[PDB]
Structure formats: C-alpha cells, structure tokens
C-alpha cells in the first residue's frame, strides 16, 4: 500500500 | 466536554500514557480536551494530536475498505439483504464523525492562531488529510470535499516552500500526502509523480546542510517518497 | 438495549462482518444483542461470542498491564501526581465493566438453558475465564472472585471428564485455562503443571481415534499445553 | 507469555 505520513 | 474538568497538563500526561498503552481512542479524547483549553499547542503536543487521530481514523478506514470490498462483491452474487450496506454505512458515519471532529478543532481555533510556519503548515496539512479521508468515502458534494482538501494542501505547500528548507520533515510529509491526494483522489497520477520526484530531488540536494540526526529524520521520509515512486512507475 | 430492534440473524451476520473488519467492540455489541434475543446459541454462535469478547477484554488487559507497570515504577522516583493511578483506574473500571457484562449474559440466561456438554462446558469455562480476568486486577473480595473462577472451572472440568473424550478441543482449552488459573491466580504452580501434563498425556493416547481434521484441531491445543509446560519447568 | 485459549 502506498505511503502517507 | 467530558474533559473540561481535567487540567491541561494532566490531559497531556494521560495522552502520553494512552499512547504507551496503545489506547488511541482515549489518546484522541485527551488531546481533544487539551486543544479545547484554548491555548496553542507546542511541537510535541501537535505530534500527540496527530498520532492519536491518525490511529483512530486509520482503524476506521481499514474497516471501511474491508466492508466496501464485501459490499462491491455482493453487487457482482446472492442477495444477503441490507446488512452489509448498513454496517458499511455505520462505520462510514463514525469515520466521518471523527474527521468532522478534527476539522472542527482546526477551525475552532487552531489554524487561525497558528502564525509560525511549523505550526501553520502542520495544521493545514492535517486539514488536507482529513478532507482527503472524507473524500475517500464520498459519493454524492464530493467535488467540494475534494477541493477543500486541495485548497488546504495548496496553502500549506505555498507556506512551506517560502518558509522551510526542502529537507524539513513537515514539508516532506506534506508533499508525500499531497502527492497521494493527486494520485488517489484527484485522478492526477502525473502530478503525483512529478511532485514526489521534485520533492525528493530538492531534499537530496539539501541533505549536506544537516546534522546526523536531522539527516536521519529527513531521509526516512524521502524513502517514503521513493517507495511511492517505485510503486507508481 | 440498542440492538433490540435488529433481527437475530442480522446481528449474527454483522458480527461476522465485524470480525472480518477487526471491529471487535462492534462484534461484541452485536453478539450481546443476539444473546439478548433469548434463544440458545449454536456452536458457531458461541464461538463468535467468545471471539468478540476475548479480543475486547484482551486489549483492555494488555493496556492495564502497561499502565500497572508504569504505576509500580512510579512507586519505586519522582512524584508525577495522581494521573497514572487515575488512568489505570479508568482502564480497570472499563475492563471490569466488560467482564460484568459477559458474566451477566452467562447468568441471564445462557448457562441455565445449556444442557448439552459442549454448550454447558463452554459457558462454564467462559465464566471461569471472566472471573479470572476480574481476579487479575482485584486487590480488595479478591478471595471470593478467585473462588468464583475456581468453582466455574471445576464444574466445567467435572462435566468435561464425564461427557467428553480427552481430545475434545473444549475440554483441552478448559484444562489449559484452568492450569493458567492455578499457576497465575491461585499460587498453585504444581497443580498447574500436573493438570497440563495429565491433560496432554491423556489426549496423546486418544489421538488414534480421530480423523485428520480432528487430529489437527486437538494437536493445536496440545501444543499450547506443551508450550506452558516448557515455560514453567 | 504463557498461553490461554
Ligand atoms: Cl449496522
Ligand atoms: Cl483518567
Ligand atoms: Mg488549569
Ligand atoms: Mg454514508
Ligand atoms: Mg506521462
Ligand atoms: Mg425476528
Ligand atoms: Mg479499581
Ligand atoms: Mg515440585
């Protein structure tokens, strides 16, 4: 899954 | 509010205990109580607020995605009745409630009192984040929700570019999340990729100014930008 | 109760959805609603009840242990005020509330209607388990709480020995937990070790009667008995 | 940590 902070 | 009778410092102390206990709903309630005391938040306190609500809404979003997938499969299939939609709607409503709560704290009155770049950009990024979580489940004013996220992110970007170095962890994390916004929400994968790459490259060129500890802080978030670029290209 | 207007079958359906979403508080509320419909529970439904509350109370116990350790260190140290004790007490009260809720469902009226060995032993084991969780935090009627756990476990043991084969997973799991009760709660490690060993050995001798699938079910719990024996000897 | 069911 793509990263967010 | 139920925290109105507790000292601000006690609320902060208990928020930190709740984090250690992985009791993030308690942590969020404590930090909500601290915000409602009306004083500005320190760097550490802003982090506690962010950690608390990110974990709470993260559980809700993960649950919503599980239920949404089940619901979508149900509409591909035996009729199981209204229960899947009902329960997805229950989780969705609770999620929207948490986002509205965070956005309410930012609007009353965290953002308007935040004058330093580190506080103002942090709060505006958070505003973009929680409108983005609203956008993830929106199916009706969806365009206005999306534009609210975009506008908050854009104001944060403009301030961070003028007031912060390219390696600043808040600036980096803002760019990471606005890039995800472009990719996932705004149907602009090229903008998402351009933003992540330019952010990474400009941070790379500024690392030489940093101490060892700041270098570690900045490179950690740069790695997340690279991870997304690898996933998307 | 808030679930009074929902169909029993819908409550069970949503409990299963909540499990998939890892929303165990919702799962427990749904199964509480199903129990309160007043009909007996099937094997699968009893499992859903157990899974829901075990996960809810498991989060609370883990948090309580974190906070209790911090509190104990605080009394070894700078005075930090009442906040650590207050917050441990808050988590403890919520935990006791969940145990009281489960014990209330068992007493009104699950146990008295349970006539088959598999249902009766299951419910009595659960009664022992939730009195045991009460005993873990008890510091005052502590002896009566401990004896309530012991008595529930003992009645379950007596029925399971008479009505179930030694490999029955409910009998095995009851013995595992009563052994932990002896070790952790009753200050009887020798009884704990004797029970785990005799349970393991008698199950070993009965495995030859089982299908491949039952063998897998039984050996999984036997491995937990062996794990505890290894830890304790 | 010791096992329970
Ligand atoms: Cl529902
Ligand atoms: Cl408290
Ligand atoms: Mg004060
Ligand atoms: Mg909705
Ligand atoms: Mg292209
Ligand atoms: Mg009915
Ligand atoms: Mg107490
Ligand atoms: Mg001895």
Short mmCIF file of C-alpha atoms and ligand atoms in Angstrom, two decimals:
data_model
loop_
_atom_site.label_atom_id
_atom_site.label_comp_id
_atom_site.label_asym_id
_atom_site.label_seq_id
_atom_site.Cartn_x
_atom_site.Cartn_y
_atom_site.Cartn_z
CA UNK A 1 0.00 0.00 0.00
CA UNK A 2 1.26 3.47 -0.96
CA UNK A 3 2.73 5.51 1.87
CA UNK A 4 1.28 8.53 3.59
CA UNK A 5 2.76 10.01 6.76
CA UNK B 1 -16.93 18.40 27.07
CA UNK B 2 -16.14 15.45 29.34
CA UNK B 3 -12.53 16.63 29.73
CA UNK B 4 -13.49 20.16 30.80
CA UNK B 5 -12.68 19.48 34.45
CA UNK B 6 -9.20 17.99 33.87
CA UNK B 7 -6.01 20.08 33.93
CA UNK B 8 -4.38 20.73 30.58
CA UNK B 9 -1.11 19.22 31.79
CA UNK B 10 -2.90 16.12 33.13
CA UNK B 11 -4.62 15.65 29.77
CA UNK B 12 -1.24 15.77 28.01
CA UNK B 13 0.27 13.39 30.56
CA UNK B 14 -2.60 10.93 30.07
CA UNK B 15 -2.40 11.23 26.28
CA UNK B 16 1.20 10.01 26.52
CA UNK B 17 0.16 7.15 28.82
CA UNK B 18 -2.63 6.22 26.39
CA UNK B 19 -0.12 6.11 23.54
CA UNK B 20 2.07 3.72 25.56
CA UNK B 21 -0.99 1.56 26.21
CA UNK B 22 -1.99 1.74 22.51
CA UNK B 23 -5.33 3.21 23.64
CA UNK B 24 -5.70 5.64 20.76
CA UNK B 25 -9.38 6.48 21.27
CA UNK B 26 -8.51 7.59 24.82
CA UNK B 27 -5.45 9.40 23.47
CA UNK B 28 -7.61 11.35 20.99
CA UNK B 29 -10.20 12.26 23.62
CA UNK B 30 -7.42 13.53 25.91
CA UNK B 31 -5.84 15.65 23.16
CA UNK B 32 -9.25 16.97 22.12
CA UNK B 33 -9.67 18.07 25.74
CA UNK B 34 -6.25 19.73 25.70
CA UNK B 35 -7.00 21.62 22.46
CA UNK B 36 -10.31 22.83 23.92
CA UNK B 37 -8.41 24.53 26.76
CA UNK B 38 -7.84 27.22 24.12
CA UNK B 39 -4.06 27.61 24.33
CA UNK B 40 -1.81 26.98 21.36
CA UNK B 41 -0.08 23.59 21.10
CA UNK B 42 3.68 23.03 21.31
CA UNK B 43 5.56 20.95 18.73
CA UNK B 44 5.31 17.82 20.91
CA UNK B 45 1.62 18.42 21.62
CA UNK B 46 0.83 18.83 17.92
CA UNK B 47 2.51 15.47 17.31
CA UNK B 48 0.39 13.83 20.02
CA UNK B 49 -2.80 15.19 18.44
CA UNK B 50 -1.73 13.91 15.02
CA UNK B 51 -0.70 10.46 16.29
CA UNK B 52 -3.95 9.99 18.24
CA UNK B 53 -6.36 10.82 15.45
CA UNK B 54 -4.28 9.16 12.71
CA UNK B 55 -4.52 5.86 14.58
CA UNK B 56 -8.23 6.24 15.32
CA UNK B 57 -9.20 7.14 11.77
CA UNK B 58 -6.75 4.55 10.43
CA UNK B 59 -8.65 1.74 12.10
CA UNK B 60 -11.91 3.11 10.71
CA UNK B 61 -10.57 3.47 7.16
CA UNK B 62 -9.14 -0.06 7.17
CA UNK B 63 -12.50 -1.40 8.36
CA UNK B 64 -14.39 0.69 5.79
CA UNK B 65 -12.23 -0.73 2.98
CA UNK B 66 -12.88 -4.32 4.12
CA UNK B 67 -16.63 -3.70 4.24
CA UNK B 68 -16.70 -1.75 0.96
CA UNK B 69 -14.97 -4.65 -0.80
CA UNK B 70 -17.50 -7.12 0.60
CA UNK B 71 -20.33 -4.82 -0.49
CA UNK B 72 -18.91 -4.49 -4.00
CA UNK B 73 -18.59 -8.26 -4.34
CA UNK B 74 -22.20 -8.58 -3.14
CA UNK B 75 -23.24 -6.46 -6.14
CA UNK B 76 -21.35 -8.52 -8.74
CA UNK B 77 -23.97 -13.00 -6.21
CA UNK B 78 -26.66 -13.99 -3.72
CA UNK B 79 -28.82 -11.31 -2.16
CA UNK B 80 -27.82 -11.15 1.50
CA UNK B 81 -30.17 -8.30 2.42
CA UNK B 82 -29.31 -4.80 3.63
CA UNK B 83 -26.87 -5.77 6.37
CA UNK B 84 -23.58 -5.28 4.50
CA UNK B 85 -24.58 -1.80 3.29
CA UNK B 86 -25.99 -0.92 6.73
CA UNK B 87 -22.82 -1.91 8.53
CA UNK B 88 -20.56 -0.19 5.99
CA UNK B 89 -22.73 2.91 6.47
CA UNK B 90 -22.36 2.67 10.25
CA UNK B 91 -18.56 2.53 10.02
CA UNK B 92 -18.57 5.28 7.38
CA UNK B 93 -20.70 7.57 9.58
CA UNK B 94 -18.40 7.04 12.55
CA UNK B 95 -15.38 7.78 10.35
CA UNK B 96 -16.96 10.97 9.03
CA UNK B 97 -17.70 11.92 12.62
CA UNK B 98 -14.02 11.66 13.58
CA UNK B 99 -12.95 13.69 10.52
CA UNK B 100 -15.55 16.36 11.35
CA UNK B 101 -14.23 16.47 14.92
CA UNK B 102 -10.64 17.01 13.79
CA UNK B 103 -11.67 19.60 11.20
CA UNK B 104 -13.69 21.32 13.90
CA UNK B 105 -10.67 21.60 16.19
CA UNK B 106 -8.59 23.01 13.34
CA UNK B 107 -11.29 25.58 12.54
CA UNK B 108 -12.04 26.43 16.20
CA UNK B 109 -9.43 27.68 16.63
CA UNK B 110 -6.06 26.06 15.93
CA UNK B 111 -5.38 27.35 12.42
CA UNK B 112 -6.33 30.97 13.00
CA UNK B 113 -3.93 31.29 15.93
CA UNK B 114 -1.04 29.45 14.20
CA UNK B 115 1.50 32.01 12.95
CA UNK B 116 4.80 30.15 12.79
CA UNK B 117 5.49 28.13 9.65
CA UNK B 118 5.91 24.84 11.54
CA UNK B 119 2.53 25.12 13.27
CA UNK B 120 0.57 26.64 10.38
CA UNK B 121 1.84 24.16 7.77
CA UNK B 122 1.24 21.27 10.18
CA UNK B 123 -2.38 22.28 10.79
CA UNK B 124 -3.09 22.97 7.13
CA UNK B 125 -1.63 19.60 6.15
CA UNK B 126 -3.91 17.99 8.75
CA UNK B 127 -6.89 19.85 7.29
CA UNK B 128 -5.99 18.48 3.86
CA UNK B 129 -5.55 14.98 5.30
CA UNK B 130 -8.95 14.83 6.98
CA UNK B 131 -10.80 16.27 3.98
CA UNK B 132 -8.95 13.61 1.98
CA UNK B 133 -10.29 10.89 4.29
CA UNK B 134 -13.76 12.36 3.80
CA UNK B 135 -13.14 12.29 0.03
CA UNK B 136 -12.22 8.58 0.17
CA UNK B 137 -15.80 7.67 1.17
CA UNK B 138 -17.66 10.49 -0.59
CA UNK B 139 -20.10 9.53 -3.36
CA UNK B 140 -22.58 12.43 -3.59
CA UNK B 141 -20.69 17.46 -2.57
CA UNK B 142 -17.81 15.11 -3.37
CA UNK B 143 -16.24 17.75 -5.64
CA UNK B 144 -16.39 20.37 -2.90
CA UNK B 145 -14.83 17.94 -0.39
CA UNK B 146 -12.01 17.23 -2.85
CA UNK B 147 -11.46 20.93 -3.46
CA UNK B 148 -11.38 21.60 0.28
CA UNK B 149 -8.57 19.07 0.62
CA UNK B 150 -6.73 20.56 -2.38
CA UNK B 151 -7.05 24.11 -1.06
CA UNK B 152 -5.73 23.24 2.40
CA UNK B 153 -2.80 21.31 0.90
CA UNK B 154 -2.05 24.14 -1.54
CA UNK B 155 -1.93 26.81 1.18
CA UNK B 156 0.37 24.55 3.22
CA UNK B 157 2.61 23.96 0.19
CA UNK B 158 2.89 27.68 -0.55
CA UNK B 159 3.94 28.48 3.03
CA UNK B 160 6.33 25.52 3.27
CA UNK B 161 8.09 26.47 0.04
CA UNK B 162 8.62 30.04 1.24
CA UNK B 163 9.41 29.41 4.93
CA UNK B 164 11.02 25.97 5.23
CA UNK B 165 14.09 24.21 3.84
CA UNK B 166 13.46 21.37 1.36
CA UNK B 167 14.53 18.78 3.94
CA UNK B 168 12.10 19.92 6.63
CA UNK B 169 10.18 16.79 7.76
CA UNK B 170 6.86 18.66 7.82
CA UNK B 171 7.41 19.96 4.28
CA UNK B 172 8.42 16.46 3.15
CA UNK B 173 5.43 14.77 4.75
CA UNK B 174 3.07 17.40 3.36
CA UNK B 175 4.44 16.75 -0.13
CA UNK B 176 4.15 12.99 0.32
CA UNK B 177 0.47 13.28 1.30
CA UNK B 178 -0.45 15.88 -1.33
CA UNK B 179 1.15 13.55 -3.88
CA UNK B 180 -1.09 10.72 -2.64
CA UNK B 181 -4.02 13.14 -2.91
CA UNK B 182 -3.15 13.76 -6.56
CA UNK B 183 -2.72 10.06 -7.28
CA UNK B 184 -5.72 8.61 -5.41
CA UNK B 185 -8.29 11.39 -5.10
CA UNK B 186 -7.77 13.90 -7.90
CA UNK B 187 -7.11 11.39 -10.73
CA UNK B 188 -3.80 13.18 -11.44
CA UNK B 189 -1.10 10.49 -11.29
CA UNK B 190 1.30 12.58 -13.37
CA UNK B 191 1.04 15.45 -10.88
CA UNK B 192 1.52 12.93 -8.06
CA UNK B 193 4.71 11.57 -9.63
CA UNK B 194 6.10 15.00 -10.54
CA UNK B 195 5.55 16.29 -7.00
CA UNK B 196 7.15 13.26 -5.34
CA UNK B 197 10.19 13.36 -7.65
CA UNK B 198 10.82 17.12 -7.36
CA UNK B 199 10.37 16.93 -3.59
CA UNK B 200 12.83 14.04 -3.35
CA UNK B 201 15.43 15.68 -5.61
CA UNK B 202 15.31 19.06 -3.86
CA UNK B 203 15.65 17.37 -0.46
CA UNK B 204 18.59 15.29 -1.72
CA UNK B 205 20.48 18.48 -2.63
CA UNK B 206 19.90 19.98 0.85
CA UNK B 207 21.00 16.98 2.96
CA UNK B 208 24.59 18.27 3.15
CA UNK B 209 23.47 21.11 5.47
CA UNK B 210 22.08 18.75 8.12
CA UNK B 211 23.33 17.16 11.30
CA UNK B 212 23.37 13.37 11.60
CA UNK B 213 20.06 13.37 13.50
CA UNK B 214 18.30 15.70 11.05
CA UNK B 215 19.72 13.67 8.15
CA UNK B 216 18.08 10.56 9.63
CA UNK B 217 14.75 12.37 10.08
CA UNK B 218 14.72 13.69 6.50
CA UNK B 219 15.97 10.57 4.73
CA UNK B 220 13.28 8.49 6.44
CA UNK B 221 10.53 10.49 4.73
CA UNK B 222 12.47 10.70 1.46
CA UNK B 223 12.39 6.89 1.46
CA UNK B 224 8.58 7.01 1.58
CA UNK B 225 8.57 9.30 -1.45
CA UNK B 226 10.84 6.85 -3.27
CA UNK B 227 8.62 3.92 -2.23
CA UNK B 228 5.61 5.59 -3.82
CA UNK B 229 7.55 6.48 -6.97
CA UNK B 230 8.61 2.84 -7.27
CA UNK B 231 5.02 1.69 -6.84
CA UNK B 232 3.68 4.19 -9.41
CA UNK B 233 6.31 3.96 -12.18
CA UNK C 1 -30.70 -2.42 24.50
CA UNK C 2 -29.58 -0.62 21.35
CA UNK C 3 -29.76 -3.88 19.35
CA UNK C 4 -33.34 -4.66 20.40
CA UNK C 5 -34.76 -3.62 17.04
CA UNK C 6 -32.37 -5.68 14.87
CA UNK C 7 -33.16 -9.21 13.69
CA UNK C 8 -31.24 -12.01 15.39
CA UNK C 9 -29.94 -13.25 12.04
CA UNK C 10 -28.84 -9.73 11.03
CA UNK C 11 -26.95 -9.37 14.31
CA UNK C 12 -25.12 -12.64 13.63
CA UNK C 13 -24.40 -11.60 10.04
CA UNK C 14 -22.99 -8.26 11.22
CA UNK C 15 -20.93 -9.92 13.95
CA UNK C 16 -19.19 -11.93 11.22
CA UNK C 17 -18.64 -8.77 9.14
CA UNK C 18 -17.24 -7.01 12.22
CA UNK C 19 -14.81 -9.88 12.76
CA UNK C 20 -13.60 -9.54 9.15
CA UNK C 21 -13.14 -5.80 9.72
CA UNK C 22 -11.37 -6.46 13.06
CA UNK C 23 -14.02 -4.30 14.73
CA UNK C 24 -14.28 -6.36 17.90
CA UNK C 25 -16.19 -3.82 20.00
CA UNK C 26 -18.90 -3.82 17.32
CA UNK C 27 -18.68 -7.61 17.13
CA UNK C 28 -19.27 -7.89 20.90
CA UNK C 29 -22.21 -5.47 20.85
CA UNK C 30 -23.79 -7.46 18.00
CA UNK C 31 -23.37 -10.79 19.81
CA UNK C 32 -24.66 -9.28 23.05
CA UNK C 33 -27.75 -8.26 21.07
CA UNK C 34 -28.09 -11.78 19.67
CA UNK C 35 -27.81 -13.38 23.13
CA UNK C 36 -30.47 -10.98 24.47
CA UNK C 37 -32.95 -12.33 21.89
CA UNK C 38 -33.29 -15.17 24.43
CA UNK C 39 -32.72 -18.19 22.18
CA UNK C 40 -29.89 -20.62 22.78
CA UNK C 41 -26.69 -20.21 20.74
CA UNK C 42 -25.40 -22.70 18.17
CA UNK C 43 -21.79 -23.93 18.18
CA UNK C 44 -20.77 -21.27 15.64
CA UNK C 45 -22.61 -18.53 17.51
CA UNK C 46 -20.95 -19.46 20.80
CA UNK C 47 -17.58 -19.15 19.06
CA UNK C 48 -18.49 -15.68 17.76
CA UNK C 49 -19.43 -14.55 21.27
CA UNK C 50 -16.16 -15.89 22.66
CA UNK C 51 -14.00 -14.36 19.90
CA UNK C 52 -15.65 -10.94 20.24
CA UNK C 53 -15.27 -10.54 23.99
CA UNK C 54 -11.85 -12.21 24.15
CA UNK C 55 -10.49 -9.58 21.76
CA UNK C 56 -12.19 -6.68 23.55
CA UNK C 57 -11.04 -7.70 27.01
CA UNK C 58 -7.63 -8.65 25.61
CA UNK C 59 -6.97 -5.09 24.52
CA UNK C 60 -8.05 -3.83 27.95
CA UNK C 61 -5.88 -6.32 29.86
CA UNK C 62 -2.81 -5.50 27.75
CA UNK C 63 -3.39 -1.79 28.39
CA UNK C 64 -3.95 -2.39 32.11
CA UNK C 65 -0.65 -4.28 32.36
CA UNK C 66 1.25 -1.44 30.65
CA UNK C 67 -0.28 1.13 32.99
CA UNK C 68 0.14 -1.04 36.10
CA UNK C 69 3.85 -1.43 35.33
CA UNK C 70 4.24 2.34 34.92
CA UNK C 71 2.39 2.87 38.20
CA UNK C 72 4.58 0.35 40.02
CA UNK C 73 7.75 2.02 38.74
CA UNK C 74 6.33 5.38 39.88
CA UNK C 75 6.21 3.96 43.43
CA UNK C 76 9.81 2.71 43.46
CA UNK C 77 11.04 8.02 41.57
CA UNK C 78 9.63 11.49 41.01
CA UNK C 79 6.09 12.25 42.11
CA UNK C 80 4.07 12.71 38.92
CA UNK C 81 0.74 13.30 40.66
CA UNK C 82 -2.42 11.18 40.53
CA UNK C 83 -2.66 10.82 36.75
CA UNK C 84 -1.07 7.37 36.34
CA UNK C 85 -3.26 5.83 39.05
CA UNK C 86 -6.34 7.66 37.71
CA UNK C 87 -5.81 6.42 34.17
CA UNK C 88 -5.03 2.86 35.30
CA UNK C 89 -8.25 3.02 37.33
CA UNK C 90 -10.20 4.21 34.29
CA UNK C 91 -8.96 1.31 32.16
CA UNK C 92 -9.50 -1.11 35.07
CA UNK C 93 -13.11 0.06 35.54
CA UNK C 94 -13.85 -0.35 31.84
CA UNK C 95 -12.32 -3.83 31.92
CA UNK C 96 -14.39 -4.82 34.95
CA UNK C 97 -17.43 -3.49 33.12
CA UNK C 98 -16.83 -5.82 30.16
CA UNK C 99 -16.29 -8.81 32.47
CA UNK C 100 -19.50 -7.98 34.35
CA UNK C 101 -21.34 -7.77 31.03
CA UNK C 102 -20.14 -11.21 29.92
CA UNK C 103 -20.86 -12.74 33.32
CA UNK C 104 -24.30 -11.17 33.17
CA UNK C 105 -25.06 -12.80 29.83
CA UNK C 106 -23.92 -16.17 31.17
CA UNK C 107 -26.11 -15.78 34.26
CA UNK C 108 -29.12 -14.36 32.36
CA UNK C 109 -29.64 -16.87 30.96
CA UNK C 110 -27.11 -18.81 28.89
CA UNK C 111 -25.84 -21.28 31.50
CA UNK C 112 -29.19 -22.30 32.93
CA UNK C 113 -30.53 -23.26 29.50
CA UNK C 114 -27.35 -25.09 28.39
CA UNK C 115 -27.89 -28.85 28.71
CA UNK C 116 -25.51 -30.43 26.22
CA UNK C 117 -21.94 -30.98 27.36
CA UNK C 118 -20.43 -28.85 24.58
CA UNK C 119 -22.56 -25.81 25.41
CA UNK C 120 -22.52 -26.17 29.21
CA UNK C 121 -18.75 -26.73 29.46
CA UNK C 122 -18.13 -23.84 27.04
CA UNK C 123 -20.22 -21.41 29.10
CA UNK C 124 -18.77 -22.55 32.42
CA UNK C 125 -15.23 -22.19 31.06
CA UNK C 126 -16.15 -18.67 29.94
CA UNK C 127 -17.49 -17.91 33.43
CA UNK C 128 -14.18 -19.08 34.90
CA UNK C 129 -12.25 -17.02 32.34
CA UNK C 130 -14.02 -13.75 33.08
CA UNK C 131 -13.83 -14.18 36.85
CA UNK C 132 -10.14 -14.87 36.26
CA UNK C 133 -9.77 -11.56 34.41
CA UNK C 134 -11.52 -9.88 37.34
CA UNK C 135 -9.08 -11.66 39.68
CA UNK C 136 -6.09 -10.31 37.71
CA UNK C 137 -6.93 -6.73 38.77
CA UNK C 138 -8.53 -7.46 42.16
CA UNK C 139 -6.81 -6.06 45.25
CA UNK C 140 -9.54 -5.82 47.92
CA UNK C 141 -13.48 -9.61 47.86
CA UNK C 142 -10.46 -10.83 45.91
CA UNK C 143 -10.71 -14.25 47.56
CA UNK C 144 -14.38 -14.57 46.60
CA UNK C 145 -13.59 -13.56 42.99
CA UNK C 146 -10.85 -16.21 42.86
CA UNK C 147 -13.16 -18.84 44.30
CA UNK C 148 -15.87 -17.93 41.78
CA UNK C 149 -13.40 -18.59 38.97
CA UNK C 150 -12.28 -21.86 40.59
CA UNK C 151 -15.85 -23.06 41.09
CA UNK C 152 -16.88 -22.37 37.49
CA UNK C 153 -13.75 -24.10 36.16
CA UNK C 154 -14.27 -27.07 38.49
CA UNK C 155 -17.88 -27.63 37.40
CA UNK C 156 -16.76 -27.44 33.76
CA UNK C 157 -13.93 -29.90 34.43
CA UNK C 158 -16.26 -32.39 36.13
CA UNK C 159 -18.70 -32.35 33.19
CA UNK C 160 -15.95 -32.49 30.55
CA UNK C 161 -14.30 -35.50 32.19
CA UNK C 162 -17.60 -37.39 32.29
CA UNK C 163 -19.09 -36.35 28.92
CA UNK C 164 -16.22 -35.61 26.53
CA UNK C 165 -13.25 -37.50 25.10
CA UNK C 166 -9.78 -36.38 26.25
CA UNK C 167 -9.05 -34.87 22.82
CA UNK C 168 -12.15 -32.68 22.72
CA UNK C 169 -10.93 -29.13 21.92
CA UNK C 170 -13.27 -27.58 24.51
CA UNK C 171 -12.03 -29.95 27.21
CA UNK C 172 -8.42 -29.24 26.18
CA UNK C 173 -8.87 -25.48 26.19
CA UNK C 174 -10.67 -25.59 29.52
CA UNK C 175 -7.76 -27.53 31.01
CA UNK C 176 -5.23 -25.12 29.52
CA UNK C 177 -7.00 -22.12 31.08
CA UNK C 178 -7.67 -23.76 34.46
CA UNK C 179 -3.97 -24.64 34.53
CA UNK C 180 -3.13 -20.96 33.94
CA UNK C 181 -5.59 -20.12 36.73
CA UNK C 182 -3.68 -22.42 39.09
CA UNK C 183 -0.32 -21.00 38.03
CA UNK C 184 -1.10 -17.27 37.93
CA UNK C 185 -4.09 -16.70 40.21
CA UNK C 186 -4.21 -19.44 42.83
CA UNK C 187 -0.45 -19.60 43.59
CA UNK C 188 -0.53 -23.35 42.79
CA UNK C 189 2.15 -23.91 40.12
CA UNK C 190 2.41 -27.61 40.97
CA UNK C 191 -1.32 -28.07 40.34
CA UNK C 192 -0.93 -26.07 37.11
CA UNK C 193 1.88 -28.33 35.88
CA UNK C 194 0.16 -31.56 36.94
CA UNK C 195 -3.06 -30.58 35.17
CA UNK C 196 -1.30 -29.58 31.93
CA UNK C 197 0.78 -32.76 31.85
CA UNK C 198 -2.09 -35.17 32.61
CA UNK C 199 -4.29 -33.39 30.08
CA UNK C 200 -1.58 -33.62 27.42
CA UNK C 201 -0.81 -37.29 28.11
CA UNK C 202 -4.46 -38.40 28.11
CA UNK C 203 -5.08 -36.54 24.85
CA UNK C 204 -1.97 -38.11 23.29
CA UNK C 205 -3.37 -41.59 23.97
CA UNK C 206 -6.72 -40.72 22.32
CA UNK C 207 -5.39 -39.18 19.08
CA UNK C 208 -5.54 -42.56 17.29
CA UNK C 209 -9.37 -42.40 17.28
CA UNK C 210 -9.50 -39.13 15.34
CA UNK C 211 -9.83 -38.09 11.73
CA UNK C 212 -7.12 -35.97 10.14
CA UNK C 213 -9.10 -32.77 10.72
CA UNK C 214 -9.90 -33.55 14.36
CA UNK C 215 -6.26 -34.57 14.89
CA UNK C 216 -5.20 -31.12 13.68
CA UNK C 217 -7.73 -29.40 15.97
CA UNK C 218 -6.63 -31.36 19.05
CA UNK C 219 -2.87 -31.27 18.48
CA UNK C 220 -3.00 -27.48 18.09
CA UNK C 221 -4.25 -27.07 21.66
CA UNK C 222 -1.96 -29.83 22.96
CA UNK C 223 0.92 -27.72 21.65
CA UNK C 224 -0.24 -24.83 23.85
CA UNK C 225 -0.21 -27.14 26.88
CA UNK C 226 3.34 -28.19 25.97
CA UNK C 227 4.38 -24.55 25.49
CA UNK C 228 3.24 -23.73 29.01
CA UNK C 229 4.94 -26.81 30.47
CA UNK C 230 8.17 -25.76 28.76
CA UNK C 231 7.85 -22.24 30.16
CA UNK C 232 7.11 -23.49 33.69
CA UNK C 233 9.61 -26.36 34.08
CA UNK D 1 3.78 -15.07 27.56
CA UNK D 2 2.03 -18.24 28.75
CA UNK D 3 -0.81 -19.46 26.56
CA UNK D 4 -4.51 -19.37 27.25
CA UNK D 5 -7.12 -20.15 24.61
CL1 LIG E 1 -25.29 -1.71 11.49
CL1 LIG E 2 -8.36 9.25 33.56
MG1 LIG E 3 -5.51 24.88 34.77
MG1 LIG E 4 -22.95 7.50 4.02
MG1 LIG E 5 3.20 10.53 -18.66
MG1 LIG E 6 -37.18 -11.88 14.50
MG1 LIG E 7 -10.36 -0.17 40.87
MG1 LIG E 8 7.60 -29.84 42.95
#
